[PDB]
Structures are given as structure tokens and as C-alpha cells.
Amino acid sequence: SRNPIKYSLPRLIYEDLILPNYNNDVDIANKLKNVKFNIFNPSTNYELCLFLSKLTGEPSLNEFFRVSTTPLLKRVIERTNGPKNTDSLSFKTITQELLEVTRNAPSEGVMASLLNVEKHAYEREYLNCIQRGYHPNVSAPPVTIEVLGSSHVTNSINNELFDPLISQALSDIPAITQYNMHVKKGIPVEDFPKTGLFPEPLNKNFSSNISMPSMDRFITESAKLRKLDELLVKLKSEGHRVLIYFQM
Amino acid sequence: VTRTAAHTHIKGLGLDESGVAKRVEGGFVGQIEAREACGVIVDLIKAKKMSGRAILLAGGPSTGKTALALAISQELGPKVPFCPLVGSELYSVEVKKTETLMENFRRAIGLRIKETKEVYEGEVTELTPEDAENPLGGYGKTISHVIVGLKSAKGTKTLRLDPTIYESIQREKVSIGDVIYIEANTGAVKRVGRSDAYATEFDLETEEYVPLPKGEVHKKKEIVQDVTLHDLDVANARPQGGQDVISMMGQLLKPKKTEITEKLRQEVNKVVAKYIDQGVAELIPGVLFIDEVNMLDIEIFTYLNKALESNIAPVVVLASNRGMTTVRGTEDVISPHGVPPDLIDRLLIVRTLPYDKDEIRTIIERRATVERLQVESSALDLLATMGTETSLRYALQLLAPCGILAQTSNRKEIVVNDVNEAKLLFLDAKRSTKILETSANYL
Amino acid sequence: TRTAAHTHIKGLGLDESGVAKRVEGGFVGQIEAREACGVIVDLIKAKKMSGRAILLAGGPSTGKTALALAISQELGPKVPFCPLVGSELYSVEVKKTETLMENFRRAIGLRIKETKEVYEGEVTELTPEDAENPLGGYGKTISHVIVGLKSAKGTKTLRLDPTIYESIQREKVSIGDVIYIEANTGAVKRVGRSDAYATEFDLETEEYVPLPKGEVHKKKEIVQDVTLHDLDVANARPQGGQDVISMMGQLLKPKKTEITEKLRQEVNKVVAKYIDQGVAELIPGVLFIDEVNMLDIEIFTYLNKALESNIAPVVVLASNRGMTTVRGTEDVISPHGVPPDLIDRLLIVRTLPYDKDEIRTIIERRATVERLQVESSALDLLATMGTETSLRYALQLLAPCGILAQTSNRKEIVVNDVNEAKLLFLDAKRSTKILETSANYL
Amino acid sequence: SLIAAHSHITGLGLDENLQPRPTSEGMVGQLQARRAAGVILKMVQNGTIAGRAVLVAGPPSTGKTALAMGVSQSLGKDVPFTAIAGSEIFSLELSKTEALTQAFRKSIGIKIKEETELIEGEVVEIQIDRSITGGHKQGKLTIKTTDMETIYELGNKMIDGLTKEKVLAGDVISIDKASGKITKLGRSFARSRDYDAMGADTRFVQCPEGELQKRKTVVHTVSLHEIDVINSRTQGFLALFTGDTGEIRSEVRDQINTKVAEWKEEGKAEIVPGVLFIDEVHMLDIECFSFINRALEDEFAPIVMMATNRGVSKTRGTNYKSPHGLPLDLLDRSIIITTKSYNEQEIKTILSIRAQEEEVELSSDALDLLTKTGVETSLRYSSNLISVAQQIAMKRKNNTVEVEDVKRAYLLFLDSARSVKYVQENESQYIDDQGNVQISIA
Ligand SMILES: Nc1ncnc2c1ncn2[C@@H]1O[C@H](COP(=O)(O)OP(=O)(O)O)[C@@H](O)[C@H]1O
Ligand SMILES: Nc1ncnc2c1ncn2[C@@H]1O[C@H](COP(=O)(O)OP(=O)(O)O)[C@@H](O)[C@H]1O
Ligand SMILES: Nc1ncnc2c1ncn2[C@@H]1O[C@H](COP(=O)(O)OP(=O)(O)O)[C@@H](O)[C@H]1O
């Protein structure tokens, strides 16, 4: 699938403004602004890193420089709940203490029922058996970019638009594939790629925007069939035998 | 039986074949010149040749300005798009009022498209993914391909996929024995349901069971779609439905209107023109009705002066009930109808006269016979006196308390004593103002 | 110790079922105002009323804020008290009506009692054993798990569900660690390692919590106090989930959002259901807004609406204005800057100004609280200064006298010290007089 | 629960022929206003028409929101009733028209019928198959009753619900098919060998007999705003409670209207109208009135009743004064109910029913003094004096409010006019409109 809108771009802008080469200093300025003059560099700002590690209680003093140099989604995906030492300025809130207890608490508990009113509202009003009402009219992919004669453009566009870490984050590995990687290749569970971060939809109806022809809309639009289905329920409940004659 | 709310006794303009307005037709009483002008612009819109043509409905309150807009909306039918609007709609807290006006301008230009679709559907028989050589190599995918065996009526196909379509396929949580629907246009798939070739009564997942799809697995079907240009602009501004990173990520951000650029509108217009020139698409211009146009300030009028000169402009209908009122956003500019003269020069003002007592009485008759109420002739004359004495809308909204006070006395007809009791219970604007003047502590 | 314009007042100081005695609790004078505050405190202690508003008024430097703080001290540290300025409602993230409703819900407290059965202690032996009939095609078909526990004068091994071993693997539990076990859920968690395993390695990140006291198995009835707004913000935001939206919103700025009435209705009905079960006890508190005259009239209208609710706590307002136009409108004259529709919904308390002897006693009490020594002549001169210029100006000019006394190596404040402090530091009237008589843009 | 202002009103106090009784259902007096409220209650209950604007006009402390609460109580359950103030429309995340459209669509209800299946039985064998990461889940459920044994197949949400509220293969459970609710009724097998890790004290219920699977038809009520937010985006069910529903597009609203009409034409769903009550509607811009003038002309519009205590005053957003604070085009399409002031007897019945509401016993002469001070001052002041007089009453250790207690409460707490008079001869101590004040007493 490709978007019909084509945003053409000259090659010269891409070679002389984005890609580093001998006649520009994109890479040198990137190193100067991200590495040498970074205020989280422990080689030049060890005091600030020690101050921040005393504050947050992080075990690694290189973590702030790692955080400030990586994008947001990559920070979200491999966020690991490492242990923090108790001799630190980081605290526990009242709300975090309510939230941490009620992770695996069952029903008929005070904290669990007081902390799960939205799921009680979900199962009270029968939200897993409601049909989808609205679907969008037009659906489109993002705008394609063509550069006439540059495979690096196509490689970068294919890398961004189809990022394997992001795509593996947004879905699951098949179970037989997980079995083949785990015990037939020796890869442990901790070094598996992160998977299943896509949110669950509300229903099975809300999982996609393609709506099948409704059988209920098929039967209810003809009133003769509506009366036939009205009488056929009590005819079947009577334990009967029925013949129907047609012409067409 | 039904529900009525100040309308739905109007079905159309009620004109003849030559455009002359009948006196009592389509639920209308009087307004012969206004209905003839509305018929003239009905033929102008149905000509589908003009852009940036605007009328202005001028008159007092309760004269039939909005009723004429619902009449032209019903006369054009549901095929031609009709966008009702109010002057307070354009003030958005997420985008400027110029962009809201342009979006409502583009939301009144419909489009009929005969679109072909490539469809792979059938019951899933096998599901075997082949793994990669180095799944932890950083780059690349976990799997190489996925073999899907699809079987429909009189056909059976074996499908070898990429990882990318399989991500959307396993996003729907399909399994063995479930019939799917692979739309090959966008890569989106739909879990149709379980098949009834296997068992039915052993499920807890409130499932639905559909038989095998008729025809072969690979299909090319024609679907007639009716979209607007604003939907195309929205779908290209916030892209969803592809099988890429941004197409996933766009469905989970919070929706928010953005200032759509003019370059995107040019590209959308270019691909729409190349759709029409291929014989595929058809352009259906419509009506943008803006009730209470005097609520707009001067900047929206200033942008309207340009937007009525654009080449894909719809037919705009404005309604106002001001005589000589200063335009909002200004202090000294005194203009008719609250509409500044630089746009009034571009308009075509249609005057709407008030009503007489007999017109009031037969309007009460039509609203009584629509609301399923039977009234006496003496109460009918009394309500005509109400309409000619206080207000037409006060006589319109006093039919239902009269009917309820008749029903609470075990009766179907409405008598003059019922109207007197409804006088004693409910007040009007004049009597409330009169009791407001001679008041102790700001009644 | 630190003192900041307060903390010499410990409650109101009323005797039993009667009047407020003269010099008790750090309060002097304002007998009827203390009586009104005491009977309001008893009304809140009755815990029967809702949506009862009281406004106390008077001139500046009279003790409205002191009376509100005495009310908060008389209620105790368990019943909630939410101090607020009227300027804080104008928030630019969320509408001010939602901010006012948030501070309405913040003054309603809950007393939740619960009994928790717990297991804790060091891990001495942990092994999951295979079943007697191992299933084919799988490795380590576990039938049950044996885990040994060890605490202070306590050692017990126990059987376990086999699914708990998966959480054991998720938690990285080995021999020598201390494990918190709750009964009805499983759900293992690790605190650290015992102190006997502290010095096994030279370099180690792992903390060494001491071995817990008491038996391995204990049942403690805990009591948790929470406000209704904490329940609202806990239920509104998503719980522990595996979606990318939840951990994305954890990392982003916690923007305030318009809490709907539906969530409040669900929280109130489940709290009412738990009250009818005898578990939770509802405690209403005090929302205190001083300088109420600076509220805009839309906030006053919502106060008119929301004072009629079933769960509105007691609202205490303070203002110092007289006939002054309400902010947000131009053509009304209203007492204390409060519109008359809201004025009809509250009870108005007067706070009378003080005299020479009350200023003397206030100055003496604030000198003794500050651990400062003052002469009687200096006390009389400070009383005359407070009468002549301002009581609060005599309050501010106590510590400079002490600093100038300790600069002269004296532990006593003398009239020369307060004369030097009067010369060095000016009041409002003398500053206005020097502003009127200068043409140098003073 | 707690005791509020409108706690004592439960209904409208009407006969079959809509004739109000002088003292019934907590309402006293106001015969024509209550008869008009019965008419508007019957016209809401009929559901024949839609979109009628109602004024409730009168002075303050008369019973306008009391009449609205009586209408809400006589409306009963299952009918939506959105009661908002005027200031909630102005928001920083929503336009005024969007907030009014949400307030309109919250008051129109959709009653949807559904066919569910209740499965109750003693479970026998639970086989749960999960992958290595724990994401993919499938399995089989074997349940039985006295007469029927039947195995099943488990979905993902079924296994997630079974993992919560731990089933131990012998506990009688009940599953709702369409609601997805898992309820463990108790334990019937009484297992002997048990791992002593849980604090399980499950009740001895019996194994159910008869049919395993039972069909049931249920009905649940949802309103149009909920379906709009649910169909708006991917995680709209969180936006139900967070209120992060920012300007839902018109395409969603018209498609939802079309789908709701399609549900009505098939007999699956029915449409119930409700009441949108806008308290203090004069606190609204002319934009809001101009939007209401057209939004009342739609099919999916509720019956709107709005209250106004204001006289001929300035409409907001304009420069002219209008009757009841509303422009004449909105006053044209509305019907006015005029509420009158009270005599001594109606105030006496109001104070008696309020004292009966707070379970406070009042003396006859004490009630006479309360009626006299509710006649000369406002009614709400004498109503609010009751609770503090009761507090002074058991502060004297007697459970009967005497004349001295209410006299002490009248002395301790002041009226509007008494506060105005007390300020007006002491204008120097209070901050005036110009900010000038005299803090020094000499
Ligand atoms: N010619 C007519 N026939 C029947 N009803 C009419 C006619 N003209 C006006 N009305 C009624 O008068 C009311 C006011 O009309 P509308 O155009 O909606 O507002 P306004 O006239 O104030 O702009 C409507 O409810 C409509 O039903
Ligand atoms: N009755 C009193 N007894 C002792 N100190 C008082 C009394 N009233 C006021 N004060 C003192 O006066 C100081 C300022 O009073 P404050 O409450 O700020 O006045 P206002 O109520 O006008 O804001 C406070 O630090 C308080 O300690
Ligand atoms: N007829 C009545 N029945 C019951 N309570 C009443 C009645 N009239 C007045 N009240 C009481 O008086 C108070 C004032 O009513 P309110 O609705 O605020 O008047 P308004 O119409 O001015 O808003 C309410 O708290 C209500 O409890």
C-alpha cells in the first residue's frame, strides 16, 4: 500500500543537509552538541551525576546521559523496573502504595474493589456485547516520499516506517516460534524482544473498521421475514414440524 | 408512536412543476415569495455548476428562516450533503476559527466513488510460521513468512505472507477454524467469526458463527462509496489504516484538529480531479447552512470574503434576525442584519414576511394534527388569539400541556377551560416581564 | 525550632461545655468568635452535616486565619483539613470549576480497616519437586513447591501452589533472600538479602535488610486512611497494564484532566456499599479558603451549586473587605466581596479588633514563644508602637530587637534596642509619608 | 448518608389528577408551580415530544432547585437527569458549544436489550495453556452440575478472569456469557489435602442441580454521550472517566444517530428521553443561548428546564439588559413558571420538616421564634440556625432545643443585613473599594 500523494524532493537537499559528507559538518556538530557539551557526561560533570544519583537513587551514574540521548518510544519500550536503594530522596506516594498492592488482589477485597470501579462499570453495563456504531469514511497511509535516484532514501524510509523493534513491540511472537527460540536455540526469556504492547480493543467488534453485512439488518428489513421469525421461536418451542412454500 | 420536536411537519417547499408555490403544501403556510426563491436556489444547486453563491434569510423571529433551511435540505434529499451550523460553532479551543470555517466549507463538498477492492477471504485451515536464522540479530524480523491455508466454497488457496500482514492478522487474534477477511488494499484484516462447520455449543466467548464465504478466495468487488473532501483531508492529515509504524501510532494518540495546510488541499484536489477524469469519481456539491450568522465576529466575515471566491466553494445559506446592529469585534461599524457591507454586497437577501391571524390558526391546525391531538374549534380560535396576541411559538408550545391536562381528566378533546388552566399554569415572555417590573427582590 | 507568624496557638482553648477562657491555648480576646469556632468544631465532630458553609469576617490583623488554624488543631491530624488561597483556583491547565471540585473532594476522608495474613522471613530452602506421574513432552512437571522460611524465633517450611514458582522466577528469588508472602494472592516479592550474607563479596549493589522480627506467620489488622480525591485520581488514571499508552503517560507530564461526575458517582456508591458492610468509615473535614473576595463570580456560582451536594464538607471562608464590588462584575455592591446569593447560604461571624492589653499579651506571648527576653518598659513601648502603627508591625519588630541585643552581647531587649529597630525599620504609614513628601519618584 | 439541603424532598407530592397536596413528599405550598412541575414530569414521562425549554423564575430562597430535585425524584430510576450549573460550560479543553452538546447528549437515554446465558456449576478440571511469554492463552474448562457434565473452550478474557479470584477445581462458580463476570459462589468439594498458604475460608455452598446453561434476557441503560465517547477513539472507555473527550467530530455524531435509529427500527434498542437541568442559566454567554436556540430544534434533544434568580439584568457577552438575564429569542421558545414568596405558615412547615429531617426536636415557642426570625430575615438563615442551636442544646446536656439555645445561636451568628449594618459604621477597619484602611486603633 502506497499513498497517492507523492512529495517529490531533490537529491541535493538530502545529500547536503541531512547526510554527512566531507563538505559539511552535520556529524561534527551532532557530536559537539550531544556528546562533548552534554551536561550529563560523567567525564566532565561527575558532580552533577552524583547529585542526581543521590536524588533519584539510580544504581548507575551513566543512566541520565543514556536517557537524554535516546528517543521517547525507545525509552518506553525497554524501561525495566530495576531496584533502587532505600537511602535516597525518592519516596513512595499514597497513590502508588494503593496501586502496588492491588495488582494481583482478587475480588471481595476492600482495596481491590475500591480501586477497580472502572472494571465494575465495564461488566455492569455489558460493554463486551455492544455493536460498533461509527467507522471512518476515508483511511489513508502516511504520505510517500520519492527521491529520484537514491537508495539510501528508500532504506531510511523503510527503516523508519517499518522499525523492527517497534513492530515487534506492537505485536506478539507466535508460540511455536517462542518455543523454537527458547529451548531449540538456548535464548532465555529475559533476552526475548519486548512484545504485546498494543492495547486491547474494547470488543471483538472494535478490533477493525471493516463491518460485515449484518444478518440482523438482513432479516429486519423485510417485515414478512420478521413476522416469520416472530412465529418460528414459539413454533420451535412447541416442538413442531413446519413446511414453508415459496414461488421464487 | 413517534417523536416530534418543533419540526418534521415540513417535508419540502411544496412547489408545482413550474416553480409556483402552492399556499398549503409540504406543511408550509404562506411565505410564497420566500419559497419561490428557495426553489430557485434549489434548481441552482441541482444544476451543480456554480461555486461561491450565497443567500441570506432575513426576517423577524418565528417567521420560518430555519424551517426554510430544513425545507431545502429535505428537497435536495440525503444524497446531496447538507451541513447545518451555528455561528457559535466556529470558536474552537483547539484550532483557529478560520480553520474551522474552512473545514466546514470542505465538509459540504461530497464525492461519489466507485472503488474496487481486492479481497482474500475464507476459513483458516493451517497457520504455520517459518522462523528466522538469527532472531536476535538486531535488524530483521522474528519470522520470515507465514503460510495460511484459506478454503472457501468451491475453492482452496495457500497464502504465503510477509511478516507485516501477519502482524495485523495476529492483532485480531485469529486461530485455526476462523474465517477471515484480508482486504488487500490497506492490508487491514477482519476476524469474521468462527465457522459453523465445527461445533457451536462449546464456547464461552459470546461468539458468532457464520457459514463459509461463497465464491473463490481471491475476489475483486465494486463498492460505491460516498465521502466528502474534508474526510480526505482528515485522513491524509492524521494517517491511519496502513501497516506501518505511524499508522499504528496514529490510532492511539488523542484526536485533535490541526491547521490543515493549503498544499494538502491542493494535492487532495489534484488526486480527486484525476479520479474524476478517469471516469471513476463524481462530484456532489452541497449546502453549508449557518444559522445565526450575526454571532460571527468580523474576522470570520473577512475570511468569508475570500472563501466565497474560491473555486470549490459550496452554496452557503445564512440566517439572521437583526435589523441594524453593530458587528461583533467592532465598535462603530453599524450594519444591517449584523452582517458587514463588504460581504452583504456579495449576498442575495431573501425577505421573510410575518404571518396573519388565519395563517397562525392553520399553523396551529397543522401542529395539532402532527402531534396527534384533537382540539375544539373554540379552543382553536382561542389559540389563534394567543398567536396574534403574544407569540406564535407560545401558542405552538402550549398544545402539549393542554393535551396532558385533557388526558389527566380522562378526555381526548381539548376545550377552552383547558387553555384557561394552561394560561394560569404557564406564562409567556410579556407576562413574565410584567411581573418582573413590579417585583420586590429581582423576581 | 522554627516559628513563622503562628505556632503559638494550640487549638481554641474552650473549657468543658462552656465559654472560651481568657488566656489559654495562645488565644486572647475574641470570645464570641472562639465560641462560634468551637460550636462549628463540635458540629464537624458530630459528622452529621454536609454542605454547611461559614464565613468569618473583620479587619486585617484580627485573627481569622488564626481561628481557622485553631479549628484545624482542634479537629486533630486525622480529620482532613485543606487550606487554600482564593487565587489558587485560577489554574491554566484545567478549568477552575474542576479545581474547586477537586479541593471539595480533597476534604473528605476515609478510615479503612483491613486484616492481612502475611508470611515473611529469610529463604533457607526452596525447591519445587516433580509430580509422581510426569507428563510427556514437558520438563519439570511440578506438583507443589516447598519453601522454607526463617525469622526471629521463627522457622517454618510450607507447601505452595506450583504457579507461584513462575513468579519466583520472575522475582529472582534464591537462598538467602527475604520474601514477602501475602496469603490469598500468592504474588511473591523480594525485599533484599539477610545481613549474614552481607560480606560475601567485595563489590555488590544489593541492599542488606535485616531479618524481620516476630514469627514467619502473623495477622495484623492494618488501618489505612485515604481521601476521596486520591481514589478519584487512582481510578481515573489506568492501573498496571501492558499497553504502550500507560507507560507512555507515565513518562509524560501528568496533565490535570476534567474528572467527570460518572466516576465520582461510582466511587461514592462503592464507598457507600463498603460503609454499609461496616468496613470503611467516612470522615468529613474542612475546606478553608481565605481571601474569598478574590473568587470570580463563576466560581461563586459553582459554590452556590455545590454547597447543596450530599458530600460537601464544611467550607470556611475569610475576607477583610466591606462594601466592595465582586470581581468579574462591575455594578453590584456586596459585603465582604461575596455575592448575596452565596451570602444567604452561610453564617457570618464578626471578629472584633484588639486593645492595648490584648496587644501587650500578644507581644509577651510571641516574645516567650520566640525564646526572647524583653523588659517591661520595652514591652510598654512595643504596645504603644503596636497601637500607634500596627499590631503586625509590633509582631515583625521583635526578632530585629533580639538580633541587635545579641549584637551588644545582651540576653535582654532594652528600649534602646527597640528605638534602634524603629529607626532602622519603617512601617506602612511612615513609608507612605516619605512617599508623599518626595518628588524623586520615591 | 449525610444530610444535605434537598435531602428532605422525595417526590413531588401529587395526586392522580396532578393536584398537589398542601403537605406531601417533603414539599409544602407552591401549588401552581408544583402543578406545572407535574405537567412537565408527565410530558417527560410520555416521551411523545422533545426539546421544550422551561424557565423556573423567582427570588432567591424560594424553592427552585427544590422543585428541580422533586422533579428528579419523581422521575424515578432508569431516566437520565443531567444537573449542571452555568459555570461548567466555560472550559479550557472544550468550546462552549461542545460542552453544551455533551450536556445535551448526556440526557438522552438508550435502553438496549441483550440475550445472556448464565452458566453455574461445580468445576471439575481446568486446563489452561499459556505460551512462554504468557501472552497467548487458550484452554478448556470442564464444569458439571448434578445432571449434566459439559466441557468448554476458554478465551483470553475468560482465562484472565479465572486467574483472578483463584479457582481450585471444586469451587462452584457462576459465569455470565454476555457480561463476562466470574463469580465464585463458594466451595462444595471440601478438599482435605491443601497447601496451607492461603487464608481461604470459603463458604460451604451446595452443588447446583438442574440445567447447566440458562438463557436470560437483560436490559441495560446507556446514554448517547457514552456511545459517542466509546466510538470516538481507541481508548474511549478511559475517556469516560478522565473526561479527555476533546471536541468529538460531527461525523461521529451523525453516524451514531443513524446507528441508534437503525437499532430502534430493529427492536433491539429503545430511546428514552430525560431532563437537562441548567441551574443559574444567567451565568452563560450569548453564544450559549444562540447555540441552545438551534440545538433545541433537533430530534435528539431532551426537555431542558433552567432556573434564574436574577431580575432584568445584563446578558453576558453583550451590553444590554434583558428580562431574566436571557435574550428575547430564547424567551420566545420557552414557557415560564413563576415561583412566589412564602408566608409565615409555609416557612413554619419548612422549618418543621427540616427539623424532622435532622432528627432535631424543637420546642413550640422555639419554632415560633425561628419562624419570626425567618420572616424578618431570610428563610435559609433560620434553617441553618437549627443545627448550631442543636449543637448548643447538647452542649447544655439536654436533648431539646430551647429558646435560649436558638437565641444564643442568633447572637453568635449573623445575617446579611446585620453584617452590612455592623460594617457600615466601622468602615475604617475594613478595606474599602479603594484599598484604604486604618489598621492602627489610635
Ligand atoms: N410557513 C410555515 N408553516 C408551518 N410552520 C412554520 C412556518 N413558518 C414558521 N413555522 C414555524 O415557526 C417556528 C419558527 O421557525 P424557525 O425558522 O425555526 O425559527 P425563526 O423563524 O425564528 O428563524 C418553527 O417551529 C416552525 O415550525
Ligand atoms: N486572639 C489572638 N491571640 C493571639 N494571637 C493572635 C490573635 N489574633 C491574631 N493573633 C496573631 O496575629 C497574627 C496575624 O493575624 P492574622 O490571622 O494574620 O490576621 P487576619 O485574620 O486579618 O489575616 C497571627 O500571627 C496571630 O498569631
Ligand atoms: N416548597 C418547598 N419544599 C421543600 N423545600 C423548599 C421549598 N421551598 C424552599 N425550600 C428550601 O429552600 C431552599 C431554597 O430553595 P432554592 O431552590 O435555592 O430557591 P431558588 O429557586 O431561589 O433557587 C432550598 O434549600 C429548599 O430546601
PDB file of C-alpha atoms in Angstrom, chain C residues 2 8 18 120 208 239 243 276 305 375 388 397:
ATOM      1  CA  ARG C   2      11.168  27.429  63.672  1.00  0.00           C
ATOM      2  CA  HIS C   8       1.891  29.874  69.436  1.00  0.00           C
ATOM      3  CA  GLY C  18     -18.979  26.425  78.037  1.00  0.00           C
ATOM      4  CA  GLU C 120       7.778 -13.217  55.722  1.00  0.00           C
ATOM      5  CA  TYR C 208      21.033  -5.996  53.046  1.00  0.00           C
ATOM      6  CA  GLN C 239      -3.904   0.753  36.577  1.00  0.00           C
ATOM      7  CA  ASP C 243      -0.341  -1.167  26.867  1.00  0.00           C
ATOM      8  CA  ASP C 276     -22.945  -0.491  54.805  1.00  0.00           C
ATOM      9  CA  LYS C 305     -24.437  24.903  43.157  1.00  0.00           C
ATOM     10  CA  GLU C 375      11.938  44.355  79.681  1.00  0.00           C
ATOM     11  CA  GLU C 388       0.157  53.648  67.056  1.00  0.00           C
ATOM     12  CA  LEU C 397       9.813  44.150  65.142  1.00  0.00           C
TER      13      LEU C 397
END
